[PDB]
């Protein structure tokens, strides 16, 4: 018995249906065999102790999910999911992790197995603080986020929530995995967009921390206040407007 919530109800059918849905509509991944994807996903955590999952467990899934995305148009984000995703619906050549097949399969879901059975545990799954860091969910996100960040080049963008305490959180997935896997051999600049909830938030101590982390990797840093998320989406859609 673990402290975290159990595997999401109907997780196998949900993952399969998301794969079918994504692959039948996104032409770049039409080749994918969704039954193979599920078998590979399931094989990562079934019949395994859910505190000893490795990235290698997910390698067969990563391979089936291979997707040659444009390196220069990646939008990272942290604790501002809905707006980050709205953004890539407007500026459609850009994408978030969850716009890729693998990110889309797993978004908002929970899953784990048991070491002594081939069953999915719907009762409970490990909480990353209270039980163990190396669980099926945490290790998945850590594997795909690292690879996504490693794929990035040129100017990489990150959306951050400026209304919260710790605009940049070094303990988030962005703060602990993604930012440390931006390769300086091909990423030249990280641009931060701090979103407001109704001052200059690019001066906040946590943005200076991010700037410092980034400088040390030999990557440039820009930061921008987005005061009016509504006008920002409008102007990205139609930059010819005299209001922008």
């Amino acid at each position, epitope marked *: 018995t673990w402290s975290g919530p159990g595997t999401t109800k109907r997780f196998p059918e949900t993952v399969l249906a998301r794969c079918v849905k994504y692959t039948e509509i996104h032409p770049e991944m039409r080749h994918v065999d969704c039954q193979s994807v599920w078998d590979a996903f399931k094989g990562a955590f079934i019949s395994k102790h859910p505190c000893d999952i490795t990235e290698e467990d997910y390698q067969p899934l990563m391979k089936l999910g291979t997707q040659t995305v444009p390196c*220069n148009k990646i939008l990272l984000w942290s604790r501002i999911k809905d707006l980050a995703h709205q953004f890539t619906q407007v500026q459609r050549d850009m994408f978030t992790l969850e716009d890729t097949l693998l990110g889309y399969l797993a978004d908002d879901l929970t899953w784990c197995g048991e070491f002594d059975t081939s069953k999915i545990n719907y009762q409970s799954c490990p909480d990353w603080r209270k039980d163990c860091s190396n669980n099926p969910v945490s290790v998945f996100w850590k594997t795909v986020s690292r690879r996504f960040a490693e794929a990035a080049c*040129d100017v990489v963008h990150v959306m951050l929530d400026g209304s919260r305490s710790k605009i940049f959180d070094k303990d988030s997935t962005f703060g602990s995995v993604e930012v440390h896997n931006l390769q300086p051999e091909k990423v030249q600049t990280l641009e931060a967009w701090v979103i407001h909830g109704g001052r200059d938030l690019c001066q906040d101590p946590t943005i200076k921390e991010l700037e410092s982390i980034i400088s040390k990797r030999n990557i440039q840093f820009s930061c921008k206040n987005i005061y009016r998320p509504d006008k920002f989406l409008q102007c990205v859609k139609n930059p010819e407007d005299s209001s922008c």
Partner: nanobody
Amino acid sequence: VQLQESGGGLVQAGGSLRLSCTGSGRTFRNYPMAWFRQAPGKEREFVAGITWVGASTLYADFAKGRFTISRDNAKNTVYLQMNSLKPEDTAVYSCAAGRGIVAGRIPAEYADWGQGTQVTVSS
């Protein structure tokens, strides 16, 4: 968008120039902008790019540490500071205005172009 480059000229190896690209007609403050160059018998090649939201910069490997791209929205101008010039920097340098968010390295994805300004570096 009408674009006009200036600031090119003849310099000795090791010298500097500052190119500017001034926009008449429509503003380009919400377009990504790039500098490209084209030597006499060759294809255009990416030199540097700059975004419009946060004005983030991007350089060709040959440009890093020598060239600096910048923009000033009020003046409707993009600048290329070029230091430590070499003979193989000799070319026609042109600015281009793109669309969307990022400054890509592919000339044919840029909508609006200037005529260019000559840069000649003697040995």
